Write a protein that binds this ligand. Structure first.
Ligand SMILES: CC(=O)N[C@@H]1[C@@H](O)[C@H](O[C@@H]2O[C@H](CO)[C@@H](O)[C@H](O)[C@H]2NC(C)=O)[C@@H](CO)O[C@@H]1O
Length: 184
């Protein structure tokens, strides 16, 4: 069938700037609720250690009203041709890491869609409003989209956070180490 090969050589995070090294570049539809997003260094203020990819240095901190950002991944531009997406329908894997501070609560949300050439929603993974753990530990969201049918051409990845105390500043969910990949 193989194939496996074409997908193994293309296999890479397809999100640009998953951690904040490039500030907010690569992110579109940025919604700066309250004092907006801010990139901060890894251990944050009343934040726990990220023990997991030592190579991740930073995270995006949300504020006192929803902060949302998104990325649309053009699968053809990343090397996946039409027939391969319509026919094989390879696994599209989507992860995010989020956390909260210890002196204040926060909420987190993620939605990811598989879209067609013309923005038709073929598939969707949604968490709804999530309570971020109060103790400050890091949480992994993971989803694998398979058997999604033909037509998938983009992945739209979107996440957000805000605080739960309505505080001037950056007390909302923190997000980092985001990824989407096509897996063999
Ligand atoms: C959005 C805004 O203007 N929020 C205010 C809060 O920030 C205030 O609460 C206070 O916020 C800070 C962090 O921003 C703390 O360091 C501080 O302890 C805190 N104070 C209190 C009494 O809770 C707020 C309170 O008066 O007023 C706005 O809600």
């Amino acid at each position: 069938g193989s194939h496996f090969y074409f997908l193994s050589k293309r296999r890479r995070n397809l999100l640009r700037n998953p951690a904040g090294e490039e500030d907010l570049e690569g992110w579109s539809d940025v919604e700066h609720g309250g004092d907006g997003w801010k990139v901060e260094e890894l251990p944050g203020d009343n934040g726990v250690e990220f023990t997991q990819d030592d190579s991740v240095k930073k995270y995006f901190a949300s504020s006192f009203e929803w902060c949302r950002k998104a990325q649309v991944i053009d699968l053809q531009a990343e090397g996946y041709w039409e027939e391969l997406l319509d026919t094989t329908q390879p696994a599209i894997v989507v992860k995010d890491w989020y956390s909260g501070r210890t002196d204040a609560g926060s909420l987190y949300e993620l939605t990811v869609r598989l879209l067609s050439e013309n923005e038709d929603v073929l598939a969707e993974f949604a968490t709804g409003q999530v309570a971020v753990p109060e103790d400050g530990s890091w949480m992994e969201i993971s989803h694998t989209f398979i058997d999604y049918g033909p037509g998938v051409r983009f992945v739209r990845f979107e996440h957000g956070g805000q605080d739960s105390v309505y505080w001037k500043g950056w007390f909302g969910a923190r997000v980092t180490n985001s990824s989407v990949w096509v897996e063999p």
